[PDB]
Scaffold this motif. Structure first.
Motif, PDB file in Angstrom:
ATOM      1  N   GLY A   1       0.755  -1.238   0.000  1.00 19.97           N
ATOM      2  CA  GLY A   1       0.000   0.000   0.000  1.00 19.97           C
ATOM      3  C   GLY A   1       0.788   1.292   0.000  1.00 19.97           C
ATOM      4  O   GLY A   1       0.178   2.366   0.091  1.00 19.97           O
ATOM      5  N   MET A   2       2.111   1.234  -0.122  1.00 17.65           N
ATOM      6  CA  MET A   2       2.961   2.408   0.005  1.00 17.65           C
ATOM      7  C   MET A   2       3.522   2.849  -1.340  1.00 17.65           C
ATOM      8  O   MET A   2       4.502   3.604  -1.388  1.00 17.65           O
ATOM      9  CB  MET A   2       4.082   2.125   1.006  1.00 17.65           C
ATOM     10  CG  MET A   2       3.537   1.469   2.260  1.00 17.65           C
ATOM     11  SD  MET A   2       4.522   1.605   3.747  1.00 17.65           S
ATOM     12  CE  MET A   2       5.778   0.427   3.364  1.00 17.65           C
TER      13      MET A   2
ATOM     14  N   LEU B   1       0.883   9.327   8.800  1.00 16.79           N
ATOM     15  CA  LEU B   1       0.916   8.903   7.412  1.00 16.79           C
ATOM     16  C   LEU B   1       1.115   7.397   7.334  1.00 16.79           C
ATOM     17  O   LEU B   1       1.588   6.758   8.273  1.00 16.79           O
ATOM     18  CB  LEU B   1       1.986   9.629   6.591  1.00 16.79           C
ATOM     19  CG  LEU B   1       3.459   9.302   6.725  1.00 16.79           C
ATOM     20  CD1 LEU B   1       4.134   9.761   5.450  1.00 16.79           C
ATOM     21  CD2 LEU B   1       4.032  10.018   7.922  1.00 16.79           C
TER      22      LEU B   1
ATOM     23  N   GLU C   1       1.911   7.576   2.203  1.00 17.21           N
ATOM     24  CA  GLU C   1       3.218   7.222   1.682  1.00 17.21           C
ATOM     25  C   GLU C   1       3.019   6.550   0.328  1.00 17.21           C
ATOM     26  O   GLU C   1       2.312   5.540   0.231  1.00 17.21           O
ATOM     27  CB  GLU C   1       3.944   6.297   2.656  1.00 17.21           C
ATOM     28  CG  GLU C   1       5.232   5.746   2.096  1.00 17.21           C
ATOM     29  CD  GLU C   1       6.249   6.816   1.796  1.00 17.21           C
ATOM     30  OE1 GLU C   1       6.544   7.645   2.681  1.00 17.21           O
ATOM     31  OE2 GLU C   1       6.748   6.840   0.659  1.00 17.21           O
TER      32      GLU C   1
ATOM     33  N   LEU D   1       3.951   3.394  14.337  1.00 15.24           N
ATOM     34  CA  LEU D   1       5.345   3.578  14.711  1.00 15.24           C
ATOM     35  C   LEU D   1       5.608   5.052  14.951  1.00 15.24           C
ATOM     36  O   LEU D   1       5.150   5.905  14.186  1.00 15.24           O
ATOM     37  CB  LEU D   1       6.290   3.094  13.612  1.00 15.24           C
ATOM     38  CG  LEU D   1       6.152   1.692  13.053  1.00 15.24           C
ATOM     39  CD1 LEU D   1       7.211   1.494  11.991  1.00 15.24           C
ATOM     40  CD2 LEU D   1       6.350   0.708  14.180  1.00 15.24           C
ATOM     41  N   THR D   2       6.366   5.351  15.993  1.00 14.25           N
ATOM     42  CA  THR D   2       6.742   6.730  16.264  1.00 14.25           C
ATOM     43  C   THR D   2       7.969   7.086  15.431  1.00 14.25           C
ATOM     44  O   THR D   2       9.030   6.464  15.572  1.00 14.25           O
ATOM     45  CB  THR D   2       6.996   6.923  17.759  1.00 14.25           C
ATOM     46  OG1 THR D   2       5.825   6.528  18.493  1.00 14.25           O
ATOM     47  CG2 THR D   2       7.312   8.377  18.071  1.00 14.25           C
ATOM     48  N   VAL D   3       7.812   8.047  14.527  1.00 14.15           N
ATOM     49  CA  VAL D   3       8.935   8.580  13.770  1.00 14.15           C
ATOM     50  C   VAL D   3       9.468   9.854  14.419  1.00 14.15           C
ATOM     51  O   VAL D   3      10.616  10.240  14.159  1.00 14.15           O
ATOM     52  CB  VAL D   3       8.527   8.854  12.302  1.00 14.15           C
ATOM     53  CG1 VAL D   3       9.731   9.192  11.457  1.00 14.15           C
ATOM     54  CG2 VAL D   3       7.815   7.667  11.721  1.00 14.15           C
ATOM     55  N   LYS D   4       8.675  10.510  15.262  1.00 12.18           N
ATOM     56  CA  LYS D   4       9.079  11.760  15.885  1.00 12.18           C
ATOM     57  C   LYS D   4       8.148  12.032  17.052  1.00 12.18           C
ATOM     58  O   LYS D   4       6.926  11.998  16.881  1.00 12.18           O
ATOM     59  CB  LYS D   4       9.015  12.916  14.878  1.00 12.18           C
ATOM     60  CG  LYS D   4       9.540  14.231  15.416  1.00 12.18           C
ATOM     61  CD  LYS D   4       9.302  15.372  14.442  1.00 12.18           C
ATOM     62  CE  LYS D   4       9.977  16.640  14.930  1.00 12.18           C
ATOM     63  NZ  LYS D   4       9.776  17.776  14.007  1.00 12.18           N
TER      64      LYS D   4
ATOM     65  N   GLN E   1      -4.256  -5.766   8.864  1.00 11.92           N
ATOM     66  CA  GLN E   1      -4.746  -5.065  10.054  1.00 11.92           C
ATOM     67  C   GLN E   1      -5.334  -6.034  11.074  1.00 11.92           C
ATOM     68  O   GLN E   1      -5.031  -5.958  12.272  1.00 11.92           O
ATOM     69  CB  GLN E   1      -5.788  -4.021   9.660  1.00 11.92           C
ATOM     70  CG  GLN E   1      -5.213  -2.838   8.929  1.00 11.92           C
ATOM     71  CD  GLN E   1      -6.226  -1.738   8.715  1.00 11.92           C
ATOM     72  OE1 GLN E   1      -6.974  -1.391   9.619  1.00 11.92           O
ATOM     73  NE2 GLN E   1      -6.243  -1.176   7.522  1.00 11.92           N
TER      74      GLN E   1
ATOM     75  N   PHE F   1       3.889   6.627  11.723  1.00 11.08           N
ATOM     76  CA  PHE F   1       3.908   5.867  10.483  1.00 11.08           C
ATOM     77  C   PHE F   1       3.095   4.598  10.705  1.00 11.08           C
ATOM     78  O   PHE F   1       3.439   3.779  11.561  1.00 11.08           O
ATOM     79  CB  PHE F   1       5.347   5.544  10.064  1.00 11.08           C
ATOM     80  CG  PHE F   1       5.445   4.903   8.721  1.00 11.08           C
ATOM     81  CD1 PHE F   1       5.145   5.627   7.576  1.00 11.08           C
ATOM     82  CD2 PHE F   1       5.809   3.577   8.594  1.00 11.08           C
ATOM     83  CE1 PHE F   1       5.209   5.029   6.328  1.00 11.08           C
ATOM     84  CE2 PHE F   1       5.876   2.979   7.347  1.00 11.08           C
ATOM     85  CZ  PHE F   1       5.579   3.704   6.215  1.00 11.08           C
TER      86      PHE F   1
ATOM     87  N   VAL G   1       1.729   0.994  10.097  1.00 11.16           N
ATOM     88  CA  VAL G   1       2.006  -0.298   9.482  1.00 11.16           C
ATOM     89  C   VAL G   1       0.938  -1.266   9.977  1.00 11.16           C
ATOM     90  O   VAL G   1       0.904  -1.603  11.166  1.00 11.16           O
ATOM     91  CB  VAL G   1       3.415  -0.804   9.816  1.00 11.16           C
ATOM     92  CG1 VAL G   1       3.591  -2.254   9.392  1.00 11.16           C
ATOM     93  CG2 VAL G   1       4.431   0.049   9.124  1.00 11.16           C
ATOM     94  N   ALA G   2       0.055  -1.693   9.074  1.00  7.56           N
ATOM     95  CA  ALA G   2      -0.958  -2.707   9.370  1.00  7.56           C
ATOM     96  C   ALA G   2      -1.815  -2.313  10.572  1.00  7.56           C
ATOM     97  O   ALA G   2      -2.153  -3.145  11.419  1.00  7.56           O
ATOM     98  CB  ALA G   2      -0.316  -4.075   9.592  1.00  7.56           C
ATOM     99  N   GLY G   3      -2.180  -1.032  10.652  1.00 11.35           N
ATOM    100  CA  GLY G   3      -3.011  -0.556  11.740  1.00 11.35           C
ATOM    101  C   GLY G   3      -2.264  -0.157  12.998  1.00 11.35           C
ATOM    102  O   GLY G   3      -2.890   0.332  13.945  1.00 11.35           O
ATOM    103  N   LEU G   4      -0.975  -0.385  13.056  1.00 11.04           N
ATOM    104  CA  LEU G   4      -0.268  -0.038  14.259  1.00 11.04           C
ATOM    105  C   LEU G   4       0.659   1.142  14.012  1.00 11.04           C
ATOM    106  O   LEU G   4       1.311   1.206  12.968  1.00 11.04           O
ATOM    107  CB  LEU G   4       0.543  -1.227  14.782  1.00 11.04           C
ATOM    108  CG  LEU G   4      -0.306  -2.486  14.923  1.00 11.04           C
ATOM    109  CD1 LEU G   4       0.538  -3.679  15.342  1.00 11.04           C
ATOM    110  CD2 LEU G   4      -1.462  -2.254  15.879  1.00 11.04           C
TER     111      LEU G   4
ATOM    112  N   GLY H   1       0.400   3.727   4.386  1.00  9.90           N
ATOM    113  CA  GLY H   1      -0.003   3.191   3.109  1.00  9.90           C
ATOM    114  C   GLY H   1      -1.498   2.990   2.996  1.00  9.90           C
ATOM    115  O   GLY H   1      -2.277   3.315   3.891  1.00  9.90           O
TER     116      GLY H   1
ATOM    117  N   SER I   1      -4.078   1.278   5.860  1.00  6.30           N
ATOM    118  CA  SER I   1      -3.119   1.110   6.934  1.00  6.30           C
ATOM    119  C   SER I   1      -3.678   1.540   8.281  1.00  6.30           C
ATOM    120  O   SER I   1      -2.971   1.451   9.289  1.00  6.30           O
ATOM    121  CB  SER I   1      -1.856   1.908   6.619  1.00  6.30           C
ATOM    122  OG  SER I   1      -2.202   3.250   6.317  1.00  6.30           O
TER     123      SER I   1
ATOM    124  N   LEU J   1      14.425   6.385  10.693  1.00 13.42           N
ATOM    125  CA  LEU J   1      14.292   5.355  11.706  1.00 13.42           C
ATOM    126  C   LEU J   1      15.564   4.523  11.702  1.00 13.42           C
ATOM    127  O   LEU J   1      16.110   4.209  10.642  1.00 13.42           O
ATOM    128  CB  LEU J   1      13.100   4.451  11.411  1.00 13.42           C
ATOM    129  CG  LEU J   1      11.769   5.117  11.105  1.00 13.42           C
ATOM    130  CD1 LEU J   1      10.738   4.024  10.880  1.00 13.42           C
ATOM    131  CD2 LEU J   1      11.359   6.047  12.227  1.00 13.42           C
TER     132      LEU J   1
END
Ligand code: GTP
Ligand code: GTP
Ligand code: MG
Ligand code: MG
Lengths: 174, 174, 179
Positions: A129-130, B7, B127, B169-172, A151, B162, B164-167, B9, B12, C174
């Motif tokens: 999906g990206m 953000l 993305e 990730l902290t990018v900042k 998901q 960010f 990924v599959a509903g979860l 995909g 997501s 990252l």
């Protein structure tokens, strides 16, 4: 001291040629020596492994085989080909709703089977999906459905890994 | 958090995550929309939320509406369609430089508005750069511009997630 | 203070600017090994912001061989390789049959292994730029599928050898691997 339990359900997802298969196989080798390799590639490795071919209805076939009591753990390869097979088994692949229903049922059945599993599971799936949004409705439908399946699995899974260039990022850890 | 960029995909979970963040902002939420799947989030929107349609010049319309003083926070859905609108609103969508200028101006105006905004903002974007580079120049330009816009927003934003599959990730995170 | 760094990311993810910051941390005299062969907007805007103390060696294929032959590893503080993506594209388009995967894979793996050896013996550190191209929809063209597979394999090798690996999301890195 105290005996730590490993992870029950692990999702490994990543792009094309990202090392997800090898990383998931290492997880499965960590499960034990006798591993059920459930392959989903449409048909119409350690020498101690059992290869169960199952293109669709994975919960049904894996439960009926009774092999969950025969192995140390299961590696599912892969949610990608399962979703595509589900798309191509439909009457009209340009119609999204029937494909979505069948795929959601397949994934929920797999989730339920994993909840009852005496052995742990590692599942391999793809991220699709990206990139850029395709023109044909069928490709968008496949992308949407695979996203939904990932998901669901990631919500149920105990650990989720996102493979980049052979290296895992942790998206979820108990 | 004052400014959050979410953000991810296709399919997501980025919309649901941003909607939960916005519900965390409060009960009176400004849903700034920049535009089968639309009939799922239309028929699900909290009735205490105000939905403002604004395809381009988002900073201008949001500032003029004076609604920043009336709501608890803002959710922008989505930077993706803002980038496409800006591209197809150009004289020649095959010429990259003017589209980049227009989009950079749009994003800088939004950034300025958010710095001076009395309420927090959560922005949703896609993305699109991790697939294969498509053939038509318009698609490559759109990809480039959305990438630049996401770069700008992520650099100015306080928190970036960010999906990924509903979860997330902290990018900042501040 | 890392010897080998792989910075990878999608289109317009900030990987070039981040790798250039890493390279400026290497020192002031940087060998910019460019593999593009010419799109003009990209190269123009990139060259514009290049430090005037940097040496740009254009090398579309045989990067290890050419960099060794140039003897410039002994003249600079470090190397930035831009980029593994176009290196793979060049390797694919230099074959007799770009629809035939195995010879292309062999050529790319040899290129990467030579580059790895050169980096192992390199007196200066290297930062490498590559793209992520594998998380979209599976394209139709067999040549495109070969290119995707090959770039993925090349990135796997480079990340395995690298000391630090960064994945750019929207200009922010990252950490995927850190010494
Ligand atoms: N103008 C307008 N657009 C809307 C409204 N509700 C939803 N949309 C748009 O409908 C599009 C469909 O989004 P999704 O169904 O979430 O698709 P997706 O982005 O792949 O899924 P996620 O990654 O989970 O967010 C979104 O990009 C929104 O911008 C609305 O009320 N008004
Ligand atoms: N031949 C040659 N190519 C160059 C030179 N400088 C830069 N390039 C190439 O131009 C391309 C331009 O990169 P960018 O404009 O940053 O595009 P991008 O990689 O999608 O954007 P980022 O993700 O931010 O890096 C790079 O892939 C380089 O390989 C040069 O001096 N000579
Ligand atoms: Mg959305
Ligand atoms: Mg670049």
């Amino acid at each position: 001291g105290l005996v730590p339990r490993g992870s029950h359900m692990t999702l490994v997802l990543g792009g094309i040629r990202s090392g997800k298969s090898q990383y998931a196989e290492q997880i499965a080798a960590g499960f034990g020596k006798k591993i059920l390799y459930v392959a989903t590639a449409e048909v119409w490795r350690p020498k101690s492994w059992l290869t169960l071919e199952c293109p669709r209805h994975v919960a049904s076939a894996v439960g009926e085989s009774g092999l969950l009591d025969q192995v140390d753990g299961v590696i599912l390869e892969c949610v990608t080909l399962l979703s595509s097979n589900t798309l191509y088994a439909q009457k009209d692949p340009t119609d999204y709703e029937p494909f979505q229903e069948a795929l959601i049922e397949e994934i929920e059945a797999l989730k339920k089977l994993i909840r009852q599993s005496p052995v742990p599971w590692v599942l391999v799936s793809s991220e699709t999906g990206m990139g850029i949004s395709q023109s044909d409705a069928e490709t968008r439908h496949y992308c949407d459905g695979l996203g939904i399946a990932n998901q669901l699995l990631a919500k149920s899974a105990d650990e989720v890994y996102f493979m980049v260039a052979g290296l895992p990022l942790t998206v979820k850890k108990g």
